[PDB]
Amino acid sequence: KHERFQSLSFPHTKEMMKIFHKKFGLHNFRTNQLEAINAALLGEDCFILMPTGGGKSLCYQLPACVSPGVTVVISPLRSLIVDQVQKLTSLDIPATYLTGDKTDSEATNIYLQLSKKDPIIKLLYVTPEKICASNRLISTLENLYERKLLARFVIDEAHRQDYKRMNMLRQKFPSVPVMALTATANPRVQKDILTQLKILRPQVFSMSFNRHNLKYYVLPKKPKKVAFDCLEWIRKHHPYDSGIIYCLSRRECDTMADTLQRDGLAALAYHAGLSDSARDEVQQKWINQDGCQVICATIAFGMGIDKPDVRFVIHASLPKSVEGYYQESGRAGRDGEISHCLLFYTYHDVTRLKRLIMMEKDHTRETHFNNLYSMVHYCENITECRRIQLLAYFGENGFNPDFCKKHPDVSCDNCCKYKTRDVTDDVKSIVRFVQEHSPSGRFTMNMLVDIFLGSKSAKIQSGIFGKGSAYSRHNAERLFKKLILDKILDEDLYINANDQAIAYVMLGNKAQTVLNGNLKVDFMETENKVSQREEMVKKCLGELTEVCKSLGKVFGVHYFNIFNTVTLKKLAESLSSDPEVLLQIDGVTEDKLEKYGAEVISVLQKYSEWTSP
DNA sequence: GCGTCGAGATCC
DNA sequence: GGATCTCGACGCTCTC
Ligand SMILES: Nc1ncnc2c1ncn2[C@@H]1O[C@H](COP(=O)(O)OP(=O)(O)O)[C@@H](O)[C@H]1O
Ligand SMILES: [Ca+2]
Ligand SMILES: [Zn+2]
């Protein structure tokens, strides 16, 4: 499995390794990086599957530096292009972009530079619409191609009027290699991407999509106190760190933001109800940690944000699909540092999302109900490892269920925290009871749970009243939720006089199958320091961060593009002002110590006494 | 008009 | 600390 691509004896190895160490300041290759770098430098077409934060950028940026000529990178978002170019400029790697969001005089200047004997530009980032609308671009690529200075085509996020366009590039310039990258976890989509690009004999580099540093939690939601719960959890676990709070509605964003602001927390709301410039202002404040620590957002927020130091993502209400949850929680810890993914769950939010699906135009309504049901299952599954649940959902099996046990510092709540019964007789009695009391039904799920348990609060004291005497309230609630998810029972939403969605229970499509036929129902029962030096290291880190923020203002660059969180962390841990020591740190380079070194070394020299333990 | 949530009051 | 009942507010919808 790519054994030939594991060699460090190729004619290219020496210049490649020197660029790895001297330009990038790196020391060790991550999974499949060396293999993909070697394959690309040999002129092989590559297909790379890595999760977010895996290190996909190096796979084309290191070869781009080694190769003579220009590596053309096709990317869909202007913001992701701007951020990549900032990283490369910071490292003194000649890079630029053409997105339309460039002056006509400035774009013409990029074409002028590209047509020179030595184009100098190693990486050119383009938007997919430039492949079709820019004759000036294609004529420039034609010129580079005739001169053997078109090194590679990169499709940074491979994900209609995009794929036929990338195929146009291959037909126009067939001898230039192609590298395609994707972070999509969906195994059928990974196959569709690979077959659709139709690349000749591709080298395919894939790996586990398990984000080792993401700690997944699901907590019961107290709807009237969720904002105070988020607030307390933030001040206890991440008072000085950036985060996102995902909320179901625009009003809930404004409420969440207002509550946090009243406690002195720098929080801002982000939803489509805001103007485009107001949204842009919120996003920039949040990325730069400048007047915004917490973004309280609807699904309107996300696409095109690569902030590497998000320490928490809180879902104040569950999302509408597992894919959405995976993408939203996935915004956390892109730098590999421990980050938290916390979801506040209540079944009441499920029927709030069910009324959102009932407001749409259609089979597509049944699809969204199914996707939602898959998300409710993840919430209700308080037994299986949260990592294994998400991975199994995206066709990744064989994964170690002992991961959260082997690495307890990044454990999910299910691994930190079981029987079985043939309840078919009980469900047959529930089904015959809701048949007789079938807005389309007479009772809600809560009413049904009271009756079943034989509660004094029950609205009827006959039929199934007390039938569930052997179940606890928690198990009776779980039993009824299971029947709705299993389509044995169904819910009809009724809008009351206060615009509240009320779910009345009726028979589902599988009710006649449980009684008439024999659909056996199985239910499973459940029950629910410090050091003087370490403190100085912590103090030095805050100072080092402030340095990057002031340098960021003067260079017109995001602070994390000066030095990332891992580099900053390691720099603070060293407490050294000696370059010989600083150059062994990942991301520390001669070019960066020249640019930023004076400001960085002046902070480190103040901790001179604590350098040696 | 009425379902739902959560605080307050019971007994364990 | 639960478990269980009763009373009294308060109730509201996501993306190009
Ligand atoms: N071999 C490596 N050693 C150390 N850091 C690395 C290495 N490869 C990548 N990184 C860093 O890991 C982080 C995530 O990489 P990135 O290219 O942005 O990931 P992706 O595109 O897969 O989401 C970046 O900060 C990057 O500089
Ligand atoms: Ca990327
Ligand atoms: Zn686990």
XYZ file of C-alpha atoms (C1' of nucleotides) and ligand atoms in Angstrom:
670
model
C 0.000 0.000 0.000
C 1.983 2.994 -1.528
C 5.332 1.418 -0.374
C 7.247 2.915 -3.365
C 5.972 6.397 -2.413
C 7.477 5.931 1.136
C 11.090 6.318 -0.151
C 13.516 9.130 0.864
C 15.991 8.201 -1.929
C 14.403 9.973 -4.968
C 16.457 12.595 -6.954
C 13.797 15.198 -5.754
C 14.048 14.196 -1.967
C 16.946 16.579 -1.085
C 15.277 19.783 -2.386
C 11.867 18.649 -1.097
C 13.206 17.981 2.453
C 15.050 21.341 2.490
C 11.763 23.148 1.591
C 9.858 21.056 4.254
C 12.363 22.171 6.987
C 13.412 25.696 5.810
C 10.211 27.163 4.153
C 7.503 25.408 6.195
C 9.438 24.859 9.454
C 8.075 21.283 9.750
C 9.760 18.158 11.178
C 7.455 15.093 10.780
C 5.014 14.102 8.052
C 1.450 13.149 9.049
C -0.381 10.126 7.560
C -0.162 9.892 3.728
C 1.608 13.275 3.379
C 5.051 11.964 2.346
C 3.420 9.377 -0.026
C 1.156 11.979 -1.751
C 4.082 14.499 -1.965
C 6.296 11.829 -3.629
C 3.489 10.620 -5.930
C 2.774 14.318 -7.002
C 6.480 15.063 -7.580
C 6.648 11.971 -9.819
C 3.809 13.397 -11.997
C 1.120 10.991 -10.692
C -2.588 12.087 -10.581
C -3.679 12.032 -6.873
C -6.957 11.700 -5.005
C -6.653 12.681 -1.355
C -9.247 11.982 1.371
C -8.387 13.563 4.730
C -10.640 14.940 7.500
C -10.641 18.718 8.195
C -7.391 19.641 9.951
C -5.665 16.543 8.513
C -3.068 18.602 6.616
C -4.304 18.501 3.001
C -2.638 21.882 2.130
C 0.930 20.547 2.465
C 0.190 17.723 -0.106
C 0.102 20.334 -2.954
C 1.992 23.324 -1.395
C 5.296 21.459 -0.744
C 5.345 20.041 -4.377
C 4.309 23.549 -5.686
C 7.560 24.927 -4.208
C 9.715 22.078 -5.621
C 8.179 22.064 -9.143
C 9.245 24.544 -11.841
C 6.208 26.568 -12.827
C 2.787 27.464 -11.485
C 0.461 25.215 -9.493
C -3.192 26.341 -10.279
C -5.562 25.734 -7.328
C -9.308 25.694 -7.984
C -11.240 26.626 -4.844
C -14.936 27.635 -4.529
C -14.783 30.198 -1.701
C -13.042 33.593 -1.973
C -12.549 33.625 1.865
C -10.742 30.247 1.933
C -8.512 31.500 -0.994
C -7.693 34.790 0.868
C -6.741 32.868 4.060
C -4.488 30.336 2.161
C -2.648 33.197 0.374
C -2.149 34.924 3.792
C -0.495 31.713 5.158
C 1.796 31.453 2.131
C 2.703 35.178 2.098
C 3.582 34.885 5.869
C 5.947 31.954 4.990
C 7.441 34.034 2.061
C 6.019 31.657 -0.603
C 4.967 33.599 -3.768
C 1.230 33.132 -4.123
C -1.709 35.107 -5.513
C -5.340 34.713 -6.610
C -7.907 35.720 -9.272
C -11.556 35.762 -8.017
C -13.174 38.816 -9.645
C -12.737 40.445 -6.209
C -9.468 41.898 -7.703
C -8.998 45.207 -9.675
C -8.900 45.093 -13.515
C -5.435 46.812 -13.388
C -4.259 44.410 -10.606
C -5.555 41.263 -12.446
C -3.823 42.433 -15.694
C -0.672 42.880 -13.501
C -0.930 39.192 -12.357
C -1.181 38.160 -16.084
C 1.851 40.388 -16.849
C 3.892 38.696 -14.061
C 2.784 35.207 -15.185
C 3.941 35.752 -18.810
C 7.543 36.740 -17.681
C 10.524 34.318 -18.271
C 10.423 33.460 -14.543
C 6.739 33.778 -13.399
C 7.918 33.770 -9.670
C 4.286 32.889 -8.567
C 4.344 29.266 -7.267
C 0.655 29.062 -6.321
C -2.210 30.669 -8.210
C -5.643 30.327 -6.571
C -8.722 30.630 -8.758
C -12.449 30.453 -8.387
C -14.265 27.861 -10.708
C -16.014 30.660 -12.694
C -12.564 31.960 -13.807
C -12.076 28.660 -15.855
C -14.948 29.724 -18.143
C -15.347 33.595 -18.105
C -11.646 34.609 -18.170
C -10.163 34.342 -21.658
C -7.173 36.334 -20.287
C -6.636 33.454 -17.727
C -6.920 30.549 -20.215
C -4.596 32.422 -22.676
C -2.094 32.796 -19.758
C -2.393 29.069 -18.862
C -1.900 28.342 -22.644
C 1.367 30.374 -22.531
C 2.621 28.633 -19.326
C 1.635 25.249 -20.802
C 3.578 25.764 -24.113
C 6.591 26.677 -21.908
C 6.201 23.636 -19.504
C 5.525 26.039 -16.563
C 1.984 24.717 -15.702
C 3.040 22.281 -12.917
C -0.314 20.949 -11.579
C -4.090 21.468 -11.273
C -5.335 21.241 -7.709
C -9.041 20.915 -6.775
C -8.756 21.842 -3.045
C -12.312 20.947 -2.178
C -13.696 18.526 -4.765
C -17.249 18.354 -3.122
C -22.733 20.764 -12.148
C -21.218 23.974 -13.727
C -17.923 23.116 -11.932
C -17.175 19.470 -12.844
C -17.700 19.851 -16.637
C -15.415 22.960 -16.293
C -12.599 21.048 -14.507
C -12.935 18.408 -17.244
C -12.509 21.261 -19.831
C -9.077 22.043 -18.187
C -7.964 18.406 -18.562
C -9.024 18.280 -22.223
C -7.258 21.678 -22.918
C -4.045 20.823 -20.949
C -3.885 16.929 -20.830
C -0.219 16.589 -19.819
C -0.515 18.561 -16.553
C -1.087 16.319 -13.414
C -4.183 16.738 -11.263
C -4.535 16.469 -7.503
C -8.029 16.340 -5.993
C -8.706 16.786 -2.298
C -11.859 16.310 -0.227
C -12.881 16.249 3.431
C -16.334 14.727 2.637
C -17.029 11.735 4.931
C -19.981 10.400 2.787
C -18.571 7.172 1.186
C -20.975 7.233 -1.834
C -20.010 10.876 -2.491
C -16.257 9.991 -2.221
C -16.822 7.337 -4.963
C -18.900 9.761 -7.159
C -16.115 12.439 -6.949
C -13.376 9.909 -7.935
C -15.390 8.441 -10.869
C -16.575 11.952 -12.021
C -13.038 13.418 -12.334
C -12.231 10.313 -14.522
C -8.426 10.883 -13.873
C -6.127 8.350 -15.563
C -4.693 5.748 -13.084
C -5.059 7.889 -9.861
C -3.092 7.320 -6.655
C -5.780 7.295 -3.936
C -4.692 8.296 -0.387
C -7.450 7.772 2.232
C -7.591 7.571 6.066
C -9.853 7.530 9.169
C -12.069 10.671 9.506
C -11.894 10.399 13.325
C -10.954 13.799 14.841
C -8.887 12.591 17.833
C -9.069 16.030 19.633
C -12.915 16.493 19.465
C -14.739 15.636 22.688
C -18.453 14.876 21.952
C -21.152 15.413 24.559
C -24.965 15.245 24.601
C -26.672 16.815 27.616
C -30.411 17.078 28.480
C -31.773 20.523 27.593
C -33.659 22.801 30.070
C -35.284 25.067 27.358
C -35.980 28.054 29.696
C -32.387 27.906 31.100
C -30.255 26.747 28.065
C -28.544 30.241 27.727
C -27.537 30.229 31.448
C -26.311 26.629 30.989
C -24.152 27.649 27.943
C -22.901 30.721 29.888
C -21.875 28.709 33.012
C -20.227 25.948 30.916
C -18.272 28.588 28.887
C -16.973 30.490 32.014
C -16.059 27.137 33.690
C -14.343 25.473 30.642
C -13.353 28.165 28.015
C -13.668 31.771 29.450
C -10.985 33.208 27.104
C -11.465 30.949 24.021
C -13.402 31.432 20.747
C -16.560 29.397 20.143
C -19.869 28.962 18.330
C -23.345 28.480 19.755
C -25.701 27.028 17.059
C -29.334 27.965 17.652
C -32.532 26.780 15.917
C -34.092 30.247 15.339
C -33.109 33.924 14.674
C -34.870 34.963 17.938
C -32.986 32.267 19.934
C -29.660 33.714 18.508
C -30.615 37.245 19.677
C -31.685 35.838 23.073
C -28.495 33.712 23.430
C -26.327 36.763 22.418
C -28.261 39.129 24.779
C -27.920 36.710 27.786
C -24.150 36.239 27.298
C -23.606 40.015 26.724
C -25.466 40.772 30.023
C -22.882 38.553 31.839
C -19.947 40.504 30.290
C -19.277 37.866 27.575
C -18.421 39.282 24.101
C -21.192 37.456 22.115
C -22.814 38.372 18.807
C -25.775 36.939 16.866
C -25.395 35.718 13.294
C -28.432 34.897 11.100
C -30.016 35.817 7.693
C -32.146 38.509 9.415
C -28.924 40.604 9.547
C -27.667 42.652 6.549
C -24.701 41.327 4.440
C -22.287 43.973 5.890
C -23.553 43.457 9.475
C -22.943 39.663 8.965
C -19.482 40.441 7.509
C -18.676 42.719 10.521
C -19.735 39.943 13.028
C -17.612 37.289 11.149
C -14.428 39.476 11.035
C -14.761 40.460 14.742
C -15.158 36.744 15.602
C -12.245 35.458 13.391
C -9.804 38.050 14.826
C -11.120 37.698 18.462
C -11.760 41.483 18.287
C -14.978 42.301 20.193
C -16.497 38.847 19.551
C -15.598 35.694 21.504
C -18.838 33.738 20.848
C -20.868 33.648 17.647
C -24.540 32.692 18.285
C -25.658 31.453 14.900
C -28.292 29.690 12.772
C -27.208 27.445 9.806
C -26.631 30.724 7.802
C -23.119 30.648 9.395
C -20.405 28.165 8.501
C -19.554 27.832 4.767
C -16.143 29.402 4.131
C -14.927 29.719 7.736
C -11.628 27.924 8.518
C -10.808 29.621 11.960
C -8.286 27.096 13.370
C -8.705 27.761 17.116
C -12.452 27.225 17.797
C -12.384 25.555 21.271
C -16.123 24.852 21.460
C -19.178 24.322 19.317
C -22.473 24.161 21.257
C -25.718 23.072 19.595
C -28.275 24.892 21.785
C -30.925 22.873 19.838
C -30.146 19.677 17.896
C -29.495 20.092 14.101
C -31.757 18.688 11.338
C -29.311 15.978 10.132
C -26.197 14.040 11.211
C -24.323 15.474 8.113
C -25.138 18.995 9.402
C -24.065 18.067 12.951
C -20.786 16.573 11.659
C -20.071 19.725 9.535
C -21.053 22.198 12.333
C -19.283 20.430 15.266
C -16.402 19.837 12.803
C -15.605 23.662 12.908
C -14.004 22.983 16.357
C -10.266 22.242 16.892
C -8.902 22.419 13.338
C -5.375 22.920 14.875
C -5.487 19.480 16.593
C -5.841 20.935 20.112
C -8.560 19.530 22.449
C -11.921 21.139 21.654
C -15.468 20.410 22.865
C -18.666 19.560 20.921
C -21.655 19.872 23.183
C -25.276 19.351 22.174
C -28.296 20.355 24.350
C -31.004 17.812 23.549
C -34.803 17.894 24.075
C -37.420 15.985 22.044
C -39.502 19.247 21.995
C -36.915 20.637 19.489
C -37.588 17.624 17.245
C -41.191 18.690 16.684
C -39.988 22.343 16.239
C -37.801 20.975 13.334
C -40.795 18.834 12.157
C -42.847 22.073 11.672
C -39.915 23.559 9.624
C -40.037 20.468 7.317
C -43.899 20.834 7.015
C -43.353 24.421 5.646
C -41.332 23.155 2.586
C -42.480 22.028 -0.921
C -42.082 18.329 -2.011
C -40.567 12.693 -1.493
C -37.971 15.327 -0.386
C -40.094 15.896 2.842
C -39.783 12.139 3.719
C -35.969 12.422 3.144
C -35.670 15.305 5.687
C -37.860 13.376 8.195
C -35.489 10.371 7.809
C -32.346 12.596 8.207
C -33.899 14.159 11.344
C -34.762 10.690 12.722
C -31.075 9.651 12.254
C -30.048 12.711 14.354
C -32.665 11.870 17.117
C -31.209 8.269 17.243
C -27.691 9.741 17.896
C -29.240 11.799 20.769
C -31.196 8.847 22.197
C -28.217 6.432 21.882
C -26.713 6.984 25.369
C -24.861 3.600 25.103
C -22.639 3.469 21.920
C -19.399 5.578 21.664
C -20.260 9.016 20.080
C -17.162 8.771 17.750
C -18.204 5.269 16.565
C -21.822 6.495 16.048
C -20.801 9.383 13.755
C -18.214 7.258 11.912
C -20.564 4.238 11.435
C -23.205 6.672 10.096
C -20.684 7.684 7.319
C -19.776 4.031 6.476
C -16.580 3.842 8.602
C -16.524 0.455 10.424
C -13.758 -1.556 12.129
C -12.842 1.546 14.223
C -11.492 0.846 17.760
C -14.418 1.215 20.275
C -11.621 1.365 22.945
C -10.297 4.775 21.553
C -11.985 6.977 24.221
C -10.783 4.416 26.843
C -7.135 4.378 25.539
C -7.152 8.229 25.320
C -9.376 9.354 28.306
C -8.458 13.096 27.914
C -10.553 13.179 24.618
C -13.312 10.724 25.676
C -16.961 11.181 24.634
C -19.741 11.157 27.327
C -21.008 7.607 26.384
C -17.585 6.042 27.017
C -17.356 7.882 30.420
C -20.931 6.743 31.377
C -28.008 -2.084 29.711
C -30.642 -4.897 29.267
C -33.168 -6.129 26.540
C -36.883 -7.109 26.513
C -39.506 -8.369 23.989
C -42.031 -5.532 24.682
C -44.250 -6.640 21.677
C -47.225 -7.364 24.054
C -46.861 -3.830 25.547
C -46.639 -2.094 22.110
C -49.683 -4.121 20.850
C -51.635 -2.693 23.885
C -50.258 0.880 23.217
C -51.273 0.533 19.441
C -54.864 -0.692 20.264
C -55.134 2.167 22.799
C -54.010 4.981 20.378
C -56.308 3.390 17.678
C -59.351 3.924 19.998
C -58.182 7.499 20.824
C -57.612 8.598 17.130
C -54.740 17.090 15.403
C -55.846 13.489 14.556
C -55.112 11.856 17.944
C -56.543 12.747 21.387
C -53.298 12.552 23.424
C -49.742 13.862 23.156
C -46.633 11.769 23.938
C -46.387 13.332 27.493
C -50.086 12.487 28.126
C -49.483 8.894 26.833
C -46.396 8.503 29.165
C -48.569 9.670 32.221
C -51.378 7.196 31.343
C -48.909 4.302 30.687
C -47.087 4.807 34.023
C -50.386 5.214 35.865
C -49.544 8.812 36.978
C -52.177 10.778 39.037
C -51.789 13.492 36.330
C -53.082 11.018 33.595
C -55.985 12.376 31.474
C -57.672 8.864 31.450
C -57.485 6.146 34.138
C -58.483 3.143 31.959
C -56.963 1.115 29.055
C -53.137 1.181 29.242
C -53.325 3.223 32.540
C -50.691 1.651 34.776
C -49.772 -0.960 32.060
C -46.153 0.374 32.259
C -45.896 0.023 36.091
C -42.578 -1.874 35.640
C -41.021 1.037 33.653
C -39.387 4.106 35.204
C -40.407 7.569 33.758
C -37.093 7.724 31.816
C -37.714 4.259 30.262
C -41.420 4.927 29.455
C -40.432 8.234 27.674
C -37.679 6.346 25.739
C -40.151 3.521 24.858
C -42.643 5.988 23.262
C -39.883 7.924 21.427
C -38.674 4.551 20.007
C -42.193 3.718 18.640
C -42.389 7.079 16.830
C -38.879 6.589 15.342
C -39.762 2.985 14.398
C -42.918 4.321 12.559
C -45.200 2.186 14.817
C -46.652 5.475 16.068
C -46.759 8.852 14.319
C -47.163 12.529 15.206
C -49.604 15.073 13.734
C -48.606 18.672 14.413
C -51.344 21.070 15.528
C -50.745 24.847 15.735
C -52.426 26.236 18.881
C -53.572 29.850 19.695
C -49.935 30.796 20.679
C -48.224 29.501 17.466
C -46.902 26.438 19.407
C -46.495 23.183 17.505
C -48.274 20.417 19.486
C -47.660 16.776 18.502
C -50.660 14.438 18.905
C -49.953 10.714 18.662
C -51.726 8.511 16.110
C -50.903 5.220 14.406
C -47.908 5.142 12.087
C -47.482 3.139 8.860
C -46.023 0.128 10.821
C -48.899 -0.180 13.464
C -51.001 -2.713 11.418
C -47.757 -4.755 10.870
C -47.150 -5.034 14.670
C -50.733 -6.339 15.333
C -51.976 -8.067 12.096
C -48.578 -9.418 11.045
C -45.754 -10.086 13.490
C -43.223 -7.274 13.824
C -41.370 -8.199 17.051
C -40.389 -5.103 19.162
C -37.239 -5.320 21.308
C -36.552 -2.480 23.758
C -33.411 -2.020 25.807
C -33.652 -0.510 29.290
C -31.209 2.155 30.653
C -30.588 4.362 33.796
C -29.968 8.183 33.481
C -2.094 20.692 40.237
C -0.228 23.698 38.586
C 3.462 24.823 38.678
C 5.350 28.183 38.924
C 6.829 27.530 35.417
C 3.484 26.223 33.989
C 1.687 29.440 35.123
C 4.524 31.518 33.547
C 4.181 29.397 30.344
C 0.407 30.242 30.431
C 1.230 33.977 30.959
C 3.794 33.967 28.109
C 1.202 32.367 25.771
C -1.277 35.259 26.300
C 1.526 37.795 25.628
C 2.626 35.786 22.500
C -1.017 35.849 21.290
C -1.257 39.663 21.844
C 2.005 40.049 19.821
C 0.376 38.108 16.906
C -2.739 40.267 17.160
C -0.723 43.565 16.930
C 1.504 42.102 14.107
C -1.760 40.994 12.422
C -3.120 44.578 12.413
C 0.100 46.002 10.811
C 0.537 43.122 8.227
C -3.244 43.080 7.311
C -3.228 39.403 8.286
C -5.203 37.224 10.792
C -3.140 36.667 13.974
C -3.143 32.871 13.431
C -1.404 33.393 10.028
C 1.575 35.031 11.819
C 2.070 31.919 14.055
C -0.557 29.250 14.611
C -1.818 28.012 18.041
C 0.447 24.898 18.112
C 3.586 27.009 17.259
C 2.570 29.658 19.848
C 1.876 26.896 22.458
C 5.303 25.213 21.911
C 7.070 28.658 21.897
C 5.492 29.500 25.307
C 6.402 26.004 26.696
C 10.104 26.506 25.744
C 10.418 29.991 27.477
C 13.545 30.373 25.242
C 14.920 33.444 23.382
C 17.628 31.365 21.582
C 16.976 30.841 17.807
C 18.864 27.456 17.801
C 16.135 26.164 20.234
C 13.254 28.027 18.488
C 14.072 26.470 15.048
C 13.262 22.918 16.365
C 9.611 24.059 16.892
C 7.047 23.168 14.161
C 6.169 26.287 12.142
C 9.195 28.350 13.302
C 11.223 29.385 10.257
C 14.236 31.673 9.504
C 11.971 33.873 7.263
C 9.424 34.247 10.163
C 12.028 34.880 12.894
C 13.338 37.720 10.601
C 9.828 39.223 10.115
C 8.257 38.600 13.538
C 11.198 37.443 15.665
C 12.003 40.765 17.394
C 8.450 41.155 18.864
C 8.264 37.361 19.721
C 11.816 37.052 21.283
C 11.191 40.259 23.403
C 8.214 38.499 25.113
C 10.194 35.234 25.689
C 13.244 37.043 27.178
C 11.025 38.384 30.077
C 10.556 34.721 31.252
C 14.388 34.069 31.199
C 14.475 33.012 34.913
C 11.782 30.266 34.433
C 13.338 28.805 31.173
C 15.163 26.026 33.113
C 13.149 23.806 35.570
C -58.172 27.450 25.368
C -54.583 24.341 26.615
C -49.841 21.958 26.335
C -45.522 22.426 28.277
C -41.903 23.631 31.572
C -40.102 24.513 35.985
C -40.371 25.862 40.703
C -42.268 24.645 45.090
C -44.138 21.430 48.041
C -44.360 16.581 49.467
C -42.522 11.892 51.218
C -38.381 8.325 50.153
C -30.781 13.769 45.399
C -34.410 11.605 43.502
C -39.384 10.733 42.554
C -44.089 12.619 41.966
C -47.722 15.791 42.186
C -49.776 20.606 41.663
C -49.831 25.163 40.489
C -48.818 29.148 37.531
C -46.761 31.618 33.970
C -45.894 31.721 29.100
C -46.119 30.390 24.962
C -43.283 32.328 18.210
C -40.415 29.751 12.094
C -33.643 27.385 9.080
C -30.642 28.328 4.893
C -29.448 30.695 -1.318
N 3.335 17.415 8.810
C 2.869 18.439 9.533
N 3.465 18.715 10.721
C 2.966 19.696 11.481
N 1.925 20.496 11.234
C 1.351 20.204 10.056
C 1.752 19.222 9.161
N 0.901 19.178 8.065
C 0.016 20.112 8.320
N 0.224 20.772 9.505
C -0.620 21.814 10.091
O -1.861 21.227 10.430
C -2.917 22.214 10.332
C -4.077 21.679 9.521
O -3.655 21.546 8.144
P -4.465 21.987 6.854
O -3.612 21.917 5.645
O -5.068 23.384 6.946
O -5.643 20.913 6.858
P -6.905 20.570 5.941
O -6.891 21.307 4.580
O -6.749 19.036 5.846
O -8.279 20.907 6.686
C -2.260 23.495 9.817
O -1.995 24.345 10.925
C -0.971 22.984 9.170
O 0.021 24.000 9.076
Ca -8.079 23.482 3.510
Zn -16.404 7.027 22.918
